[PDB]
Design a protein around this ligand. Structure first.
Ligand code: K4F
Ligand code: ZN
Length: 210
């Protein structure tokens, strides 16, 4: 009736597959490292497969509705997600009702194909105040969490700013905010059921060597 978290052994292609997309999609942001910390690597501590019967039905049902509406193409993609509510999401699923609505963002649940971008949001908008214990946005101690999810994009509406809206334009099912002078892409959905929390990644950002 709940979520069963299955551990993937590091020696499995799947575990290697997930950590590679994580580690390789890192980049350097204009932030100066202020939001997500200064690092050029992650120490991956754990990768778990999230299993919830209900969650994948809700997810599959919505995915059929979108295919219906998209000339039978649901346009699913594997994207990263970061926010301070990861533990609620793996048990209750994604929820559009907890979704901000203004400031720089709006009405949606954001996803990124860059893991370093989803990391900026682990502790909050901009990094919040950092970790609960040392109020440091660049902690190398505390274990952070992020999700590598299945996201049904459907017909995506492409534009430059997202803070904008609260639902998707007519005929579309997602919004891709793209780069101007943003830096990287951001995928937004306005329905929780259009995304399934496939993998739970437990990790730390590593401190640069020398
Ligand atoms: C900026 C925002 C709109 O972009 C997102 O993708 N956000 C977001 C926030 C919450 C969720 C979410 O699904 N939350 C929750 C789901 C289920 C139970 C919950 C219980 C308490 C809090 N959130 C819960 C999803 C996306 C937002 C958000 C807000 C704050 C920090 C990072 C991200
Ligand atoms: Zn800390």
């Amino acid at each position: 009736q709940g979520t069963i978290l299955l551990d993937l052994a590091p020696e499995d292609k799947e575990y290697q597959s997930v950590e590679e997309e994580m580690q390789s999609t890192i980049r350097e942001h204009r932030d100066g490292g202020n939001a997500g910390g200064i690092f050029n690597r992650y120490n991956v501590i754990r990768i778990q497969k999230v299993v919830n019967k209900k969650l994948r039905e809700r997810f599959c049902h919505r995915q059929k509705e979108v295919s219906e509406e998209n000339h039978n193409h649901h346009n699913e993609r594997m994207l990263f997600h970061g926010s301070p509510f990861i533990n609620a999401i793996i048990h209750k699923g994604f929820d559009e009702r907890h979704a901000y609505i203004g400031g720089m963002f709006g009405a949606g649940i954001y996803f990124a194909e860059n893991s370093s971008k989803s990391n900026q949001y682990v502790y909050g908008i901009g990094g919040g105040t950092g970790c609960p214990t040392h109020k440091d946005r660049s902690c190398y101690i505390c274990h952070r969490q992020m999700l590598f999810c299945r996201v049904t994009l459907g017909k995506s509406f492409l534009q430059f700013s997202t803070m904008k809206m609260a639902h998707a334009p007519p005929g579309h099912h997602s919004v891709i905010g793209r780069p101007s002078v943003l830096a990287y892409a951001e995928y937004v959905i306005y329905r929780g059921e259009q995304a399934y929390p496939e993998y739970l990644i437990t990790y730390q950002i590593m401190k640069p060597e020398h």
